[PDB]
Symmetry: C4
Subunit: 44 residues, 4 copies
């Protein structure tokens, strides 16, 4: 009951952490595209 409510709360933390992970994967991908763009302008 109190244990169950705490388990649910930790599951919410876990879910919100995955949303943050997915955001950070988007950050990595977008910065890589920007980096490759700059490199394409210099090397080609």
């Amino acid at each position: 009951s109190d244990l169950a409510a705490l388990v649910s709360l930790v599951e919410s933390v876990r879910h919100e952490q995955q949303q943050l992970r997915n955001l950070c994967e988007m950050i990595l991908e977008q910065q890589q595209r920007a980096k490759e763009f700059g490199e394409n302008l210099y090397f080609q």
Copy 2:
């Protein structure tokens, strides 16, 4: 009592995680503006 204190601690973790999420959203937005700036200099 011990359960209540642990619940409060997990709520603090959850709050701090949202502060981190909001920071990472700012990172994404700022890098997108920088990326679009570079693209504006090349495509226009």
Copy 3:
């Protein structure tokens, strides 16, 4: 005893999350400097 060990574990999660927060603040600051550098080359 089991409760105490779980509290310690959650405190470790909280600490590691702050280390991650401090890293993400460094990411924001460094990207801002890079963005401002590019802008300095164009606007001045």
Copy 4:
């Protein structure tokens, strides 16, 4: 039993947080390389 299952869940959260930390270290490193590239084009 319920305590054990909760401990396992928190350990999963901790592991997933380290995966996120490692991703964010890669973000920092890649952006630093991009920043240094731009600086190399201007200062040399």
